[PDB]
Design a protein around this ligand. Structure first.
Ligand code: FES
Lengths: 96, 177, 159, 157, 40, 70, 121, 103, 55
């Protein structure tokens, strides 16, 4: 029940993401605003999606565009490293 | 999925902005849609202790329509509290003085009779015409279909449509008209 | 103008719109193709966590691995013992789901659980409504309980 | 169509009129409505049918010219009033004799208005639970129309 | 809900009556040994 | 786009015996699975409508076939 | 004064159309009744309360087996409004000592002598 | 296009029956948002605190008195004023120190 | 004509259920709520009032 970044502290997640994408020779992502609500009020909701080659890789929610954009980076990283929430459960079945 | 705890909670419980158009609609049917969203009964995560309402914006409240002879038969009553302070007014008269009172009164009656009702009414924004402040417009997320279907007038039929409908009788040529 | 023709009017046609269902012959071919794809996904093991709906005791529980369940009666199983839940109504993954009518076949799905604790409930007060109620005309009800931990959910390519 | 012209010397000239579309779907029908199988399937919203029986100034035509039977004549007459009151016939307004102008008041939107708006009294004392006074909606003459609802239409609101 | 339809197909009105869902055993040991019969 | 009575009734006619408590869990926590069930209930409703309007002996719907037990 | 009443005999003489509707041949009459109580005896006269106890119909929605003989039928007529009667049916024959432990009664009124809880296939 | 629900918002539903007819198979892949349906981020001019301070601007009388301050707060968050007043010591001492947490 | 009309109404009535059958056969135990005269009058008379449309 522990999320990755709760056990590992990473500042500037976007910077780490850029380097990782370079290693696999992928283009830098393009940030865009997928969904929006209540922008002018004091309780706004933002969805920001990182698009690569006009193809969606990750989407994240946040209170502000900067916060939401940073959230999208963490979602992307988790998928790359295969530490997603819906990943295969660990295996204690083996008696050996 | 795979969000952090706080953004996940923030997204689920966020409040949405909706738009309704009241031209030629009956006020009662408009209230049913508005009451549903004000309470939050459109969300599968609804609970009476969770304060999950949304904002509703209605326009053209001046152009509502009443079926039958309700304009002349529906009376609104109020009392000042002083002897002789009982006033009864018909629907048409009230609509003349205040262009928003009829729609607001319908929505007020359909909400639950408790303290949260008055918090809900703070999220209801009514405009008598098609003009909205710029800040409110930026907030909107969606528009909802009108409950009633507006019949067409004769002048709005295209020439082809009149031709398509058959003729049922022919007046004798020896008729004055 | 053919016989039994009515000019279009407000009440001429029903408010609802009739629909045309797809033809049976082509649909069966499409059904077989869909089943083939899903079976390959199971065979290649392209899935993550699985969740199942299991009928146990007299209740239905949505379940997943590592979950804790509380049963409000004694079971006759020792602590630390493994069991198999045999009435499963639904198994699902990220991209596909399987529904029984009303139960899935034994081959498809296997769910195993373990007995962790055997306990009793906290005291519950029952006090019937009667004239001259009094404070001592009261009963305390405590029931036995057991706790199960769900261990694994498995599927096999036998659709 | 005969128009009287005053040039005093006056004369009336007859002109041609368009004829009914051929091939009635249900011949042997005595009234025009029956001939086209429209007995119970028209309402106030159907201006295209209703307009055909209307004078240029919104009046109803006499039965002898139209040929409608008594039952259909009453129905069409009632539906026309509701169409006028609902603002569905904008080009059939009354004629202003010399200097009369439309009252220029705001127009309240209506539909399904049984009575003349002028002469209806307000309901000052409404009733209690099952003694409530009812507000009529629609016309009784159209009761037998085809209904696509589970239960009959609610006339009293 | 659905009581009348169930009876038409010959089943019980209440799905908690006779049938496989209710009558069949709810569990068995991981080894394969059958469980003791349920009291109901 | 479904009303509550239509959704619940048609699932029963497909021999699905999920109770109301578990259905709420799927809607909140399994949005894609809930949508799949929504289509299934809608289709069975359409099959019933077709069988009603068409009269005489006609083939029954694909999803309108009832498995039997003995 | 409210008192016991006697039903006219004509009520129990059927008509040809009834035989078609309910599907019972006026010959080869069935032998065993299935009776269930579907209403309550409160607010009913005491004679009806006593008969319901004689016929064993104390619990509602539980079937009881009775003989289709005139003496029993005389009692059933008294409480006709509180009960439902269905004729028994034995498609696979009467149960034997071998099959006594495998019977199961369906809602249709059929006492099958084999119950496997498996799809018919 | 056998599915009776449009496939354009949440997922694509494909429903099939097995040959024996005892199981129903569901295939529901997710739908991604098209690029043509997105907007660019407004990079030219943000912490939520900064938004609040602009909203709760202190202009006149320096720190306002209770009443006027509460009326400002109610407008920003679309509530009534009654929400914002404090309570007495009886209610504050009943409150739990350590309420339970689920996960 | 009135008597002839009454006979016509009884013969052509489309209601399967009539007051007479239910009262005589005590369906529902309806006789708990009725008077002896109801069997004779068959629901056409109530107090001193005659019902002209009751069949
Ligand atoms: S419509 Fe044909 S005579 Fe009445």
């Amino acid at each position: 029940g522990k999320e990755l970044f709760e056990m590992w502290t990473v500042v500037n997640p976007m910077g780490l993401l850029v380097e990782e994408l370079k290693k696999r020779n992928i283009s830098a992502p393009e940030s865009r605003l997928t969904r929006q609500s209540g922008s002018t009020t004091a309780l706004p909701l933002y969805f920001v999606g990182l698009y690569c080659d006009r193809k969606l890789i990750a989407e994240g929610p946040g209170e502000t565009v900067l916060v939401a954009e940073e959230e999208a980076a963490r979602v992307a990283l988790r998928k790359l490293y295969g530490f997603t929430e819906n990943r295969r459960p660990w295996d204690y079945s083996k008696p050996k | 999925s795979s969000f952090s705890r706080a953004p996940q909670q923030w997204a689920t419980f966020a409040r949405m902005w909706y738009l309704l158009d009241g031209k030629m609609q009956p006020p009662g049917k408009l209230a049913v849609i508005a009451s549903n969203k004000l309470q939050g009964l459109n969300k599968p995560v609804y609970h009476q202790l969770s304060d999950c309402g949304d904002h509703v914006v209605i326009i053209n409240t001046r152009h509502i329509a009443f079926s039958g002879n309700k304009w002349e038969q529906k009376v609104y009553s109020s009392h000042t509290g002083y002897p002789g302070g009982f006033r009864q007014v018909t629907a048409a008269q009230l609509h003349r003085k205040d262009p928003v009172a009829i729609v607001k009164l319908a929505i007020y009656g359909m909400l639950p009779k408790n303290l949260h009702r008055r918090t809900m009414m703070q999220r209801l924004h009514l405009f008598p015409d098609e003009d909205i402040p710029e800040d409110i417009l930026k907030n909107l997320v969606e528009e909802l279909p009108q409950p009633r279907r507006v019949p067409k007038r004769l002048d709005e039929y295209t020439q082809e449509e009149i031709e398509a409908f058959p003729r049922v009788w022919t007046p004798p040529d020896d008729f004055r008209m | 103008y053919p016989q039994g023709y009515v000019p279009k009017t407000s009440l001429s046609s029903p408010p609802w719109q009739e629909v045309v269902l797809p033809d049976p012959v082509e649909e069966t071919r499409h059904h077989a193709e869909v089943v083939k794809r899903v079976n390959e996904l199971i065979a290649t093991g392209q899935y993550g966590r699985l969740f199942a709906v299991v009928h146990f005791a007299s209740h239905q529980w949505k379940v997943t691995a590592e979950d804790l369940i509380l049963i409000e009666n004694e079971l006759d199983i020792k602590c630390g013992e493994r069991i198999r839940l045999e009435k499963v109504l639904l198994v699902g993954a990220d991209n596909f789901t399987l529904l029984g009518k009303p139960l899935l076949r034994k081959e498809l799905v296997r769910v195993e659980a373990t007995v962790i604790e055997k306990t009793e409930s906290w005291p519950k007060i029952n006090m019937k409504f009667r004239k001259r109620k009094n404070f001592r005309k009261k009963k305390i009800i405590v029931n036995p309980q057991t706790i199960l931990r769900i261990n694994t959910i498995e599927i096999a390519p036998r659709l | 169509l005969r128009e009287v012209v005053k040039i005093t010397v006056i004369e009336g000239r007859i002109t041609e009129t368009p004829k009914a579309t051929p091939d009635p779907p249900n011949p042997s029908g005595q009234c025009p409505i029956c001939r086209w199988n429209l007995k119970h399937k028209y309402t106030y919203e159907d201006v295209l049918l209703l307009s055909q029986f209307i004078r240029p100034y919104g009046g109803m035509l006499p039965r002898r010219v139209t040929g409608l039977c008594r039952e259909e004549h009453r129905k069409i007459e009632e539906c026309v009033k509701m169409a006028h009151r609902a603002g569905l016939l904008p080009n059939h307004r009354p004629q202003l004799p010399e200097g009369c102008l439309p009252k220029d008041k705001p127009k309240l939107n209506r539909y399904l208005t049984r009575w003349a708006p002028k002469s209806v009294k307000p309901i000052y004392k409404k009733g209690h639970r099952w003694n409530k006074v009812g507000m009529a909606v629609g016309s009784p003459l159209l009761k037998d129309n085809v209904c696509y609802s589970r239960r009959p239409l609610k006339m009293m609101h | 809900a659905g009581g009348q339809w169930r009876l038409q197909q010959g089943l019980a009105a209440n799905p908690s009556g006779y049938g496989p869902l209710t009558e069949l055993p709810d569990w068995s040991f991981a080894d394969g040994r059958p469980a003791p019969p349920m009291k109901g | 786009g479904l009303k509550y009575p239509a959704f619940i009734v048609n699932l029963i006619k497909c021999q699905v015996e999920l109770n109301r408590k578990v259905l709420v869990d799927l809607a909140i926590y399994e949005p894609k699975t809930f949508k799949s069930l929504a289509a299934l209930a809608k289709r069975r409703q359409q099959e019933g409508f077709a069988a009603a309007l068409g009269d005489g002996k006609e083939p029954e719907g694909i999803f309108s076939r009832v498995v039997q037990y003995h | 004064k409210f008192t016991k009443s006697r039903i006219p005999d004509k009520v129990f003489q059927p008509k040809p159309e009834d035989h078609e509707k309910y599907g019972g041949d006026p010959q080869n009459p069935h032998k065993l009744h299935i009776v269930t109580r579907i209403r309550s005896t409160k607010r009913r006269p005491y004679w009806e309360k006593d008969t319901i106890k004689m016929l064993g119909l104390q619990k509602a929605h539980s079937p009881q087996i009775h003989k289709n003989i005139p003496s029993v039928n005389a009692k059933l007529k008294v409480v006709k409004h509180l009960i439902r009667i269905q004729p028994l049916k034995l498609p696979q024959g009467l149960p034997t000592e071998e099959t006594m432990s495998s019977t199961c009664l369906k809602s249709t009124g059929e006492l099958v002598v084999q119950w496997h809880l498996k799809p018919v296939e | 296009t056998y599915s009776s629900l449009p496939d354009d918002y949440n997922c694509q539903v494909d429903l099939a029956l097995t040959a024996d007819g005892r199981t129903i198979v569901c295939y529901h892949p997710s739908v991604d948002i098209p690029y043509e349906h997105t907007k660019p981020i407004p990079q030219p001019d943000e912490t939520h605190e900064q938004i609040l301070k602009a909203k709760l601007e202190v202009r006149k009388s320096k720190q306002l008195e209770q009443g006027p301050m509460i009326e400002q707060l109610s407008k920003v968050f679309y509530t009534t004023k009654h929400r914002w007043y404090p309570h007495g010591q009886y209610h504050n001492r009943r409150k739990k120190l350590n309420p339970p947490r689920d996960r | 004509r009135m008597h002839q009309n009454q006979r016509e109404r009884e013969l052509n009535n489309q209601n399967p259920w009539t007051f007479e059958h239910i009262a005589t056969a005590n369906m529902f135990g309806i006789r708990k709520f009725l008077s002896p005269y109801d069997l004779t009058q068959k629901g056409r008379y109530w107090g001193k009032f005659y019902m002209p449309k009751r069949v």
